[PDB]
Amino acid sequence: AKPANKLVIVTEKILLKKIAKIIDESGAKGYTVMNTGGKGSRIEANIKFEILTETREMAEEIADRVAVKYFNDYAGIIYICSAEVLYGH
Amino acid sequence: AKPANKLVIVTEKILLKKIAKIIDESGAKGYTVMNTGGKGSRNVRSIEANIKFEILTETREMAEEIADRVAVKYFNDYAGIIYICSAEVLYGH
Amino acid sequence: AKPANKLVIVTEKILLKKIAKIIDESGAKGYTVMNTGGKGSRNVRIEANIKFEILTETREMAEEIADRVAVKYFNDYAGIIYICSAEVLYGH
Ligand SMILES: Nc1ncnc2c1ncn2[C@@H]1O[C@H](COP(=O)(O)OP(=O)(O)O)[C@@H](O)[C@H]1O
């Protein structure tokens, strides 16, 4: 097993490509994304990204870049969970 | 960051509005939901047939309140599971 | 509450039934599965994927599922497997 951070970003669907680019530019080795619905504080259609990162710093870089650039104008939440990677490429 | 409980409810898709109502009434500030498939006990019920809710709560007690209400109201008649994970909130409205 | 391991497998959609069989054979009482997209190493393929979530009684059960899936399929198919802590509150 390898300890890891799992970064979750739930945000508006229109940001899909812009957030993917941020994720890639961070050095993250991959991400999972899915359509979801929800309600918060622009059911509404949303997207959820899950990104298992190398380090906490990598997760924080993604989170900061997304939130700073987009969260004043777009709905979203960002949170992190602990995960242990068992198998991967 | 702020520590939080992430409450997960996986249940029948037809309960979407009924569980949302309980979440809203609990004081929780939001939820995420998605369509899923799955198998469990495989007892007769009265993507595919399920929904999965994710609710980041204020407190553990709020999470438990949602869970307790859902289970008492619906889990005798409907499929489902409820669990909680730890999360840290980084950014939010 | 009952402590538990939540095993996550994200892999190719074609493997749905095959992985469900492994999960069932492990003694796991259930699983959740959903359609997702993603990208990774691009070793053998955004692509459409499936994500399983399996709450197991024990760590050993989680590991048995993970080991069987990875050995059987992950040389030849895309995927990742990871585990999170969970506490089960209610269930059938
Ligand atoms: N407390 C929460 N628990 C889980 N998901 C949440 C929570 N708060 C917000 N969300 C998710 O983030 C999305 C965006 O929330 P927010 O930015 O507050 O705006 P909105 O109410 O416009 O959806 C929600 O639709 C939901 O999917």
Ligand SMILES: Nc1ncnc2c1ncn2[C@@H]1O[C@H](COP(=O)(O)OP(=O)(O)O)[C@@H](O)[C@H]1O
């Ligand atoms: N151990 C488990 N791990 C992950 N998901 C589970 C587990 N048990 C049940 N689930 C999820 O909860 C849903 C409801 O399970 P249950 O109430 O046992 O009845 P059913 O067999 O009709 O689906 C399952 O379809 C699955 O999505």
Ligand SMILES: Nc1ncnc2c1ncn2[C@@H]1O[C@H](COP(=O)(O)OP(=O)(O)O)[C@@H](O)[C@H]1O
């Ligand atoms: N670091 C990561 N964070 C989240 N999801 C990941 C990560 N790396 C891989 N994944 C998920 O696993 C799937 C399979 O990954 P991989 O085997 O590297 O192949 P592919 O690049 O063909 O998708 C990815 O599509 C993605 O959904």
